[PDB]
Design an enzyme around this catalytic site. Structure first.
Site, short mmCIF file in Angstrom:
data_model
loop_
_atom_site.label_atom_id
_atom_site.label_comp_id
_atom_site.label_asym_id
_atom_site.label_seq_id
_atom_site.Cartn_x
_atom_site.Cartn_y
_atom_site.Cartn_z
N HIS A 18 35.45 57.67 34.17
CA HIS A 18 34.89 57.28 35.46
C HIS A 18 33.42 57.68 35.59
O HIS A 18 32.68 57.04 36.35
CB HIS A 18 35.71 57.89 36.60
CG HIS A 18 35.28 57.43 37.96
ND1 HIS A 18 34.18 57.96 38.61
CD2 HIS A 18 35.77 56.48 38.78
CE1 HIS A 18 34.03 57.36 39.77
NE2 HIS A 18 34.98 56.45 39.90
N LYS A 40 42.34 49.95 44.75
CA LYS A 40 41.14 50.50 45.38
C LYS A 40 40.78 49.75 46.66
O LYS A 40 40.43 50.38 47.68
CB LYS A 40 39.97 50.48 44.39
CG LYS A 40 40.23 51.23 43.10
CD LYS A 40 40.62 52.68 43.35
CE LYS A 40 39.45 53.50 43.86
NZ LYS A 40 38.37 53.61 42.84
N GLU A 91 32.72 50.80 45.50
CA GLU A 91 33.73 51.65 44.90
C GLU A 91 33.88 51.30 43.43
O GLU A 91 33.75 50.14 43.03
CB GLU A 91 35.08 51.51 45.64
CG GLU A 91 36.18 52.45 45.17
CD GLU A 91 35.83 53.92 45.34
OE1 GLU A 91 35.02 54.25 46.24
OE2 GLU A 91 36.36 54.75 44.58
N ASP A 94 48.24 28.27 14.60
CA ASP A 94 47.45 27.19 15.17
C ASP A 94 46.11 27.74 15.62
O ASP A 94 46.06 28.68 16.42
CB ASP A 94 48.25 26.57 16.32
CG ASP A 94 47.60 25.35 16.89
OD1 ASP A 94 46.99 24.56 16.14
OD2 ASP A 94 47.79 25.15 18.10
MG LIG Z 1 46.17 22.63 16.09
#
Ligand SMILES: [Mg+2]
Ligand SMILES: O=c1ccn([C@@H]2O[C@H](COP(=O)(O)NP(=O)(O)OP(=O)(O)O)[C@@H](O)[C@H]2O)c(=O)[nH]1
Ligand SMILES: [Mg+2]
Length: 1575
Positions: free
Chosen positions: A80, A145, A126, A1117
């Site tokens: 943070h 938040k 914030e 693919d």
């Molecule tokens: Mg393809």
RNA sequence: ACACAGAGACGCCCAGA
RNA sequence: CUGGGCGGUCUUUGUGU
């Protein structure tokens, strides 16, 4: 940079301006992370920030070298701090300093930043930090938040005179920023860089210091504890693993991990593959000697013509060589009778005897009509009076008759299959059976099909507008539209009724009625020589029906009087009828259960086809025009595809997509559609198949002759020369893309005969024979010319190293330490109940191996939930507690038990493998590990669904930033051939063990070893017929091979003598190792990316080419995107040639990794890329809307009557998001209404007119009334929005209010009218085999915490198992296939028989009468309390409902269609915002002390008090909840508190870009009709 | 008619003829 | 070759978005 300049861009208006979040992802090339030396002492942590490498991107310049130190009390907040160090260093300011002081408990807390703008405008900022790679964690942090700081700030707003304020939340993750502020991309990338450095620092500090991290919940602690204890005490007995499974030596893994990749071998192989790819490109594309594009295209055309002729000659040589055939494409008569009333008119002016002299069918029909005239009428048509008597206060009656037919008539009927098993040995039957197996010649004359497609009368008005069926549909539609009565609604309804009066729709109506009657008759039986006579309800068509059984053929013959045929469908695609004296008869034709679903859905399908194709041609629904040739061709092709319904016919059209994708290939490459000639081979059996094949080959030759012209038009690229593959007519790109999916109109759920099973076995065996003899190149060594199933170890290690480097760039160093803890978490938290499902598991075992003692037994697959319950009975709590026993059983078995079947899909033939329980248990952990690794890959899309889209549009931003304007984009869309069967699993194990710590290695090597001895059981019915035939006479050698293997005449590795299974060593199965293969392909694509980047740097003559390379990849693919900016004209052609060579070399580099490139890949396309059937044509995303439109009636079995409309709404939303306009969506919903009312008995029940006219008085969706959507926003909102709208306008709200008052005295009510399919017989049996106690509901009433806790003991696990089985998910899961015929078969008795159950069973007419009796005591309107109880989003519904009232008329203008089509998100119903957290966690945390929220005690009590107000019966004591609420059971209360936290509804729309009530109005006024602006 | 480069289905179960 | 029995019947649906 500055805190103030970021707030300066923010615009503030009126009071509290909030805005919406906007996601920023990693787009820019990061530099290397600086080296960090970390040291800890009791005085804090000192980090020596190293020198940041300097790139040209300027990113990470804020990171400066230093020795900064953070104390050991905020050591849990570097993520943070360091992320926001430099953006919040403006001291601290609480709320009360700069806001009015309201004396609540919120005084004291402080936000991150409160900037004052130095002039009098307060903006509050914030900050939030999340470690979740998924986008869900970012949204969760953002919403937590904003909910924490919304309500107090909004309270402090109203105490100021002019509160010009702004609230902002900024959440930072590893690869994403969620912020609502105008923050530029550079600051977001800097935030990611700072986050990465901070996370590496925090991980380095935590890895040597226990107390830095906050104490985790002890559930998590025990989860990692049990996972670590398992993985450190798991002995797989590697000696037995090596002795049992082939090539499972751990020395392979040791040498792969320890030996570095051979660099010289890699470079030599790369250069050799470069030379080979260059030679192949020059040979195949005629690059040398030098010629211009005309001669090259002419040579390509000649080559395509020669290959087409070779295929045609080869097909003709194996056929019957007949050039003329009489075989109708449509095996139904073209009759278009005028629909009339319900009566039997068989008055023959010449007598029945004149029918006797007209052949076998004439004799049959004469005897049938004589028996009808001289017999009881009861059975020909359904009796209205009997059903009225039954309904006012099961058995099936059909009119059966036994004609005494001659032997010639019986022979003629047996030639068609009617009682054809008896006549099998006759000579004519044997000759017909012999001739039925022959195939058709490709040179067969099929000009009549083309004549029908070009010239038909399908779209001609039948002038049947005022007939009973269309009057009924009109009345139902008018009552549905009475709640939405607008002029635009009237215009769209008139368009629908004009489409309903079309010739083809009127034909399809009686065809669907006949199909419904046949589906009803499928459950009947007849003796030998006995037939059923039936009369269609609205038409003078008589049907003779011969049933065999439910799983076999149904035979039918049609008859009509010649004077009753008002008109006919023109064309010669129909089968020949029989012309008697005054009657027209039809030969016997057969149907199955799977073939009836297209005929039943035919009218709605054709209405949808007409509406869709007339919208894509640009004619408005409210205009009437004469049909054109393109519309007739598309509609007729859809007609022929729907009526044909064969797999090959679908496949030929489906392959046109890859045939026509070649037209986008750019120079120096040529279009190569002839590559698809391999998949076009195979038997031709219908004239439609021959015609489609010839048109496909003509399209192939035409495309090989000339590519699609690329036209720069302003700053946008279009394509010219596109055309329909089948018709050949010129059309735009959208219609050409949509025409690739016309084959999808064929039925996906086609039944598989035994005949077609062996071919699927052929898909498995033919890869096992290609197994390498020696395992040297299966993981041990290096090869430059790999064989099948082989791969190179050095190339595999190089790809793994490339992906590891890219992962280290993204998630930082020490990423493996975080992956270790996350994997341990996912393995430890999950319990054995989470694996319980209603999905089938294999029962194949050692007892089923020999066919001799199982030839009489019958095999079935059980369910995984039963085996899970059996494990739970033995006190098995966690999955990781059962992995050991599962692996021990697998190892003792020595193999992996699989059972096979065939997938129902729209792409061809693929097999499906089902494992047993033990293999599932062992495989699940490996798949979890592989998924956790794949979620770290920055370009893997299966585990990261967002990466399916984001990389493609961000490639343009990368190109613009790195090169500037004027960059050329060249893409390759790749497919892999035989992906699952090609991968030898040692490679997958090595790839997975590369990315894991060694403690998981011994498991991963063992668990993947079982894949190298797979025993796959075959169908026993197949072996029953294979056993009796020792000698095979087929022309397919696999059929001889399997027979000889089973009988023992031939010795093969895959099969043994007299066994029920095939043995497989190589390859994986369908999706079993999905994530591991995705990780492998990610490694390969990362290797390709680095290789292409290096090649671009080195250049072709010593200077670098400026280029940006992106890769996207899924299971198999993938796509590659390369953007280059040339500096001149000669440099342009040289750079394009270089990029073309780089993309062409992928096909040659793939076999080194065991991946084989499919011929469906489209390589070297400019401004064009397709990834997941998502077609990006420059700045125009094209989606095949026809694909989703053709599946808008694929319903599931729903026991409740109101769930049908929910399924229809889901399908309608899927159609809308596919790219359909709102008017098209409304017309599709009109067709859905017609389908829904047809399934209720519109064409099958005489008591429908009474039901219709008496349901008008009670429009209740529970009792079968269909609610229609608003035409201006059709499909945008769900079914509940329409229900809420009907409650506020129609008298349905009065009924709901009365029912609520009745249930108060002493959505939810819409599901109170139910029907039980098979009266839950088998479901009950599913409870009669576990031993589950019936006291479960009272026991969980005693202990409600079991509903909100993971697990404590086996009794609680049994309790949640009993709750799981008593759920709608388990209930609505035993439904088998072919939903539509089974559902419509109940439409003959649903209205007027006691089958419906109400919250004693009654009829729908009886329920409607009882509702009408109770409809005289309805009073008032629905209460606001239940207006929030039944509809939590009702107020939200209101802001949409009032936003559609200003669009009511059909006013507008036809504007020029600006094509910048992108995909956008619209939040139409947002999350309910009064309560900061969910009620499910709010109740649980207070009741049982479980830290399910992130609030302190004060905020928790505030939310508790807010939860008090709405329900008002809520109590702190669960016993007081039990005795102080309407819900008698805690099960109902849990469902209530789950559902009361309403969902957020968002729609994905396709259209013009949306600049964010404004968005909804914009998409209403634009997306009503393409090229048209409303009002 | 369906399935199929001829692996199937065109009924299955009984009791008596 | 005579009278019968036959549906959520079985086939049938796996791994991931
Ligand atoms: Mg393809
Ligand atoms: O239904 C499906 C479809 C696809 N898959 C997974 O996706 C992989 C490829 O699915 P695919 O459709 O590309 N067929 P493929 O095996 O590559 O051969 P080809 O037709 O020549 O391209 C398969 O190997 C499975 O791993 C499934 O698991 N289930
Ligand atoms: Mg593939």
């Amino acid at each position: 940079m500055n805190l103030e300049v970021l707030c300066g861009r923010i615009n503030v208006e009126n009071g509290l301006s909030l805005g919406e979040p906007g996601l920023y992802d990693q787009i820019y090339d990061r530099p290397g992370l600086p080296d960090l030396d970390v040291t800890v002492d009791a005085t804090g942590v000192t980090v020596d920030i190293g020198a940041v490498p300097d790139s040209a991107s300027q990113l990470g310049s804020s990171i400066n070298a230093g020795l900064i130190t953070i104390q050991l009390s905020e050591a849990y907040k570097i993520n943070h701090d360091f992320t926001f160090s430099g953006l919040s260093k403006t001291t601290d300011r609480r709320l009360s300093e700069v806001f009015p002081i309201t004396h609540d408990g919120s005084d004291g807390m402080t936000p991150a930043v409160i900037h004052t703008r130095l002039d009098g405008t307060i903006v509050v900022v914030e900050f939030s930090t999340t470690r979740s790679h998924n986008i869900g964690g970012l949204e969760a942090a953002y919403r937590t938040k904003i909910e924490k700081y919304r309500d107090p700030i909004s309270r402090r707003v109203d105490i100021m005179e002019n509160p010009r304020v702004f609230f902002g939340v900024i959440v930072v993750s590893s690869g994403g920023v969620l912020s609502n502020m105008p923050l530029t991309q550079d600051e977001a990338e800097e935030l990611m860089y700072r986050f990465c450095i901070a996370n590496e620092i925090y991980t380095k500090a935590r890895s040597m210091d226990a107390d830095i991290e906050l104490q985790k919940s002890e559930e998590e602690l025990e989860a990692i504890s049990r996972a670590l204890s398992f993985f450190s005490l798991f002995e797989p007995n590697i000696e037995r693993v090596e002795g049992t499974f082939p090539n499972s030596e751990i020395k392979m893994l040791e040498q792969f991990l320890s030996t570095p990749a051979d660099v010289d071998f890699i470079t030599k192989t790369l250069k050799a593959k470069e030379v080979e790819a260059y030679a192949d490109l020059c040979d195949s594309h005629y690059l040398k000697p030098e010629k211009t594009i005309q001669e090259r295209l002419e040579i390509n055309r000649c080559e395509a013509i020669d290959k087409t002729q070779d295929l045609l000659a080869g097909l003709h040589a194996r056929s019957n060589k007949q050039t003329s055939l009489n075989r109708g494409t449509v095996k139904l008569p073209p009759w278009l009778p005028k629909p009339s009333s319900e009566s039997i008119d068989i008055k023959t002016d010449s007598g029945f005897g004149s029918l006797m002299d007209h052949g076998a069918y004439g004799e049959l029909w004469a005897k049938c009509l004589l028996d009808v005239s001289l017999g009881n009428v009861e059975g020909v048509v359904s009796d209205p009076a009997k059903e009225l008597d039954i309904a006012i206060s099961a058995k099936i009656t059909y009119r059966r008759f036994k004609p005494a037919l001659s032997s010639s008539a019986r022979q003629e009927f047996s030639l068609q299959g009617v009682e054809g098993k008896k006549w099998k040995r006759m000579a004519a039957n044997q000759k017909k059976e012999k001739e039925s197996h022959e195939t058709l010649s490709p040179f067969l004359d099929v000009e009549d099909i083309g004549d029908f497609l070009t010239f038909n009368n399908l779209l001609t008005d039948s002038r049947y507008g005022d007939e009973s069926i269309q009057r009924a549909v009109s009345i139902l539609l008018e009552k549905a539209s009475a709640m939405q009565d607008t002029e635009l609604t009237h215009a769209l309804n008139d368009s629908f009724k004009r489409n309903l009066s079309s010739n083809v729709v009127q034909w399809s109506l009686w065809v669907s009625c006949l199909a419904q009657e046949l589906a009803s008759a499928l459950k009947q039986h007849c003796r030998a020589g006995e037939f059923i006579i039936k009369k269609l309800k609205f038409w003078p068509i008589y049907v003779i029906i011969k049933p065999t059984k439910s799983s076999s053929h149904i035979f039918y013959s049609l008859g009509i009087r010649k004077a009753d045929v008002t008109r006919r469908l023109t064309g010669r695609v129909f089968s020949d009828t029989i012309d008697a004296g005054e009657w027209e008869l039809t030969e016997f034709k057969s149907l199955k259960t799977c073939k009836l679903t297209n005929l039943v859905n035919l009218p709605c399908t054709m209405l949808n086809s007409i509406a869709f194709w007339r919208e894509k041609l640009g004619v408005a629904p409210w205009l009437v025009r004469k049909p054109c040739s393109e519309l007739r061709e598309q509609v007729g092709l859809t007609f022929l595809i729907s009526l044909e319904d064969k797999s090959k016919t679908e496949e030929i059209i489906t392959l046109t997509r890859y045939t026509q994708m070649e037209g986008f290939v750019s120079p120096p490459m040529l279009p190569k559609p002839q590559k698809m000639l391999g998949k076009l081979d195979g038997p031709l059996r219908t004239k439609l198949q021959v015609y489609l094949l010839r048109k496909h080959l003509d399209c192939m030759v035409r495309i090989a002759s000339q590519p699609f012209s690329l036209i720069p038009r302003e700053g946008r690229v279009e394509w010219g020369g596109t055309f329909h593959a089948i018709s050949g007519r010129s059309t735009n790109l959208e219609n050409m893309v949509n025409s690739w999916y016309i084959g999808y109109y064929k039925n996906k759920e086609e039944s598989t005969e035994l005949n077609a099973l062996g071919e699927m076995y052929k898909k498995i065996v033919e890869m096992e024979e290609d197994k390498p003899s020696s395992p040297e190149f299966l993981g041990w060594g290096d090869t430059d010319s790999p064989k099948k199933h082989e791969f190179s170890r050095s190339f595999l290690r190089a790809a793994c190293s490339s992906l590891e480097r890219e992962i280290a760039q993204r998630h930082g160093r020490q990423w493996k330490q975080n992956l270790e803890e996350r994997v341990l978490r996912e393995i430890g938290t999950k319990n054995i109940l989470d694996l319980a499902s209603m999905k089938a598991t294999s029962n194949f075992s050692k007892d089923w191996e020999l066919y001799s003692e199982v030839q009489t037994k019958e095999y079935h697959r059980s369910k995984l939930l039963e085996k899970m319950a059996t494990l739970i009975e033995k006190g098995v709590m966690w999955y990781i507690d059962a992995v050991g026993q599962a692996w021990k059983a697998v190892l003792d078995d020595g193999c992996m038990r699989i059972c096979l079947f065939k997938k129902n899909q729209h792409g061809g033939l693929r097999e499906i493998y089902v494992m047993d329980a033990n293999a599932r248990l062992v495989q699940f952990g490996v798949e979890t590990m592989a998924r956790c690794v794949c979620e770290l890959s920055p370009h893997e899309t299966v585990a990261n669904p967002r990466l399916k889209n984001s990389i493609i549009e961000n490639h343009g931003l990368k190109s613009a930033r790195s090169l500037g304007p004027g960059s050329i984009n060249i893409n390759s869309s790749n497919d892999a051939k035989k992906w699952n069967q090609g991968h030898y699993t040692t490679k997958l194990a090595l790839v997975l063990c590369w990315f894991m710590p060694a403690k998981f290695h011994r498991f991963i090597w063992a668990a993947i070893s079982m894949f190298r001895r797979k025993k796959m059981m075959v169908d026993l019915r197949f072996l029953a017929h294979l056993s009796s035939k020792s000698e095979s006479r087929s022309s397919d050698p696999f059929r001889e091979a399997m027979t000889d293997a089973f009988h023992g005449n031939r010795d093969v590795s895959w099969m043994d003598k007299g066994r029920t299974y095939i043995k497989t060593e190589t390859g994986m199965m369908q999706g079993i190792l999905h994530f591991t293969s995705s990780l492998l392909h990610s490694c390969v694509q990362s290797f390709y990316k680095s290789y292409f980047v290096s090649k671009l740097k080195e250049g072709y003559m010593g200077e670098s080419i400026s280029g940006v390379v992106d890769v996207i990849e899924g299971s198999d693919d993938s796509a590659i995107m390369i953007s280059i900016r040339p500096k001149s004209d000669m440099d342009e052609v040289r750079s394009r040639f270089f990029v073309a060579n780089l993309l062409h070399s992928v096909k040659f580099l793939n076999p080194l990794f065991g991946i084989y490139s499919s011929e469906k890949s489209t390589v070297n396309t400019v401004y064009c890329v397709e990834y997941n059937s998502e077609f990006h044509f420059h700045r125009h995303l094209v989606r095949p809307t026809l694909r989703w439109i053709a599946a808008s009636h694929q319903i599931s079995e729903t026991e409740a009557l109101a769930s049908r409309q929910e399924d229809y709404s889901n399908l309608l939303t899927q159609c809308l998001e596919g790219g359909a306009s709102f008017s098209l969506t409304y017309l599709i919903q009109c067709a859905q209404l017609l389908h829904h009312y047809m399934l209720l008995g519109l064409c099958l029940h005489p008591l429908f007119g009474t039901f219709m006219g008496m349901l008008i008085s009670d429009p209740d969706p529970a009792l079968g009334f269909f609610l229609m959507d608003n035409p201006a926003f059709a499909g945008g909102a769900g079914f509940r929005f329409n229900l809420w709208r009907a409650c506020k306008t129609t008298d349905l709200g009065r009924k709901y209010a009365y029912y609520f008052n009745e249930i108060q005295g002493k959505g939810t009510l819409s599901h109170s009218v139910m029907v039980y399919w098979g009266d839950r017989k088998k479901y009950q049996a599913l409870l009669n085999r576990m031993g589950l106690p019936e006291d479960w509901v009272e026991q969980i009433d005693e202990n409600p915490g079991v509903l909100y806790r993971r697990a404590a003991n086996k009794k609680e696990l049994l309790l949640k198992l009993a709750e799981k089985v008593h759920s709608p998910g388990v209930t609505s899961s035993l439904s088998k296939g072919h939903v539509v015929p089974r559902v419509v078969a109940a439409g003959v008795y649903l209205l007027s028989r006691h089958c419906f159950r109400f919250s004693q069973k009654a009829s729908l007419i009886k329920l409607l009468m009882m509702s009408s009796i109770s409809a005289m005591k309805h009073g008032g309107s629905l209460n606001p309390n239940q207006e929030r109880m039944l509809f939590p989003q009702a107020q939200e519904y209101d802001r949409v409902c009032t936003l559609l009232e200003e669009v009511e008329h059909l006013t507008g203008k036809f504007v020029v269609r600006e094509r910048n089509i992108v995909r956008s998100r619209i939040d139409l119903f947002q999350e309910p915002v009064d309560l900061r957290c969910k009620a499910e966690d709010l109740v649980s945390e207070v009741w049982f002390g479980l830290k399910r929220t992130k609030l302190g005690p004060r905020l928790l009590k505030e939310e508790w008090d807010k939860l008090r107000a709405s329900f008002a019966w809520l109590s702190t004591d669960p016993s007081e909840t039990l005795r102080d609420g309407p819900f008698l059971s805690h099960v109902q209360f849990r469902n209530f508190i789950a559902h009361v936290d309403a969902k957020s509804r968002s729609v994905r729309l396709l259209g013009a870009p949306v600049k964010k009530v404004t968005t909804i109005s914009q998409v209403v006024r634009m997306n009503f009709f393409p090229g048209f602006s409303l009002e």
